[PDB]
């Protein structure tokens, strides 16, 4: 198990009546407290891709391979649309019926948002967790420890395979479940932080400085 880090930059907008002004927003902080409902209004065409985030839901307008229009709908704003489907300067795509909180673990920290007159174009840094579990069958050995950070690039499964070689996706916390065996061991444990004076398999007693 390897519970992953994602972060978007995207875009929402609503009317001024309606938003709560912050620069932040925790897992579960409310973002906008609606009075009347709202149809979110397609600002520019392309194909759609959306994305579940539990409660909250994400929209990318693609034009060919390039992506060109994102868009945040959170969670109490559900989607009139589906993957695939061409859609035009002024479609509805969401509709904002209650009340408009954030997932349980989804985030949208340092938001940058610009006033229009009669609404609000917000965009959003968008931090959140989706883990991804991988096989370790016999040969092989996992090669960094369980609670333990890790960044984009670095090896986390080492093997004679390129093709069986585990690299990290990006910034993301490593678990692991279901051993094979448990070694129980009636061994007393000393967490340290730098140098150590002390071999593997040394003869050490009580007031033994390690």
């Known amino acids: 198990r390897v519970d992953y880090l994602r972060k978007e930059r995207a875009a929402l907008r609503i009317p001024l009546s309606a ?13 906008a407290e609606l009075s009347e409902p709202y149809l979110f209004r397609a600002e520019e065409s392309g194909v759609v891709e959306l994305k579940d985030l539990a409660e909250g839901h994400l929209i990318y307008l693609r034009q060919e391979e390039e992506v060109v229009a994102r868009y945040f709908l959170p969670a109490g704003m559900t989607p009139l649309v589906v993957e695939g489907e061409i859609v035009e300067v002024g479609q509805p795509l969401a509709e904002g019926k209650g009340l408009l909180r954030l997932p349980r673990h989804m985030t949208a920290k340092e938001v940058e948002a610009e006033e229009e007159g009669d ?7 968008l931090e ?3 883990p991804k579990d991988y096989k370790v069958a016999p040969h092989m050995n996992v090669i960094v420890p369980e609670g333990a950070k890790v960044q984009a690039g670095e090896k986390i499964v080492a093997a004679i395979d390129p093709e069986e070689e585990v690299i990290a996706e990006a910034e993301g916390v490593v678990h692991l ?7 129980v061991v009636k061994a007393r444990v000393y967490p340290f932080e730098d140098d150590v004076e002390v071999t593997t398999g040394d003869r050490v007693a009580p007031g033994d400085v390690l």
Not at 20 to 28: L, N, S
Not at 119 to 125: E, K, M
Request: aromatic letters at 14%; a negative charge.
């Open 19 to 31: 938003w709560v002004e912050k620069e932040a927003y925790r897992p579960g902080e409310v973002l």
């Open 177 to 183: 479940h279901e051993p094979a065996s448990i070694l």
């Open 119 to 125: 609404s609000v174009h917000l965009t959003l840094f």
């Open 128 to 130: 959140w967790t989706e």
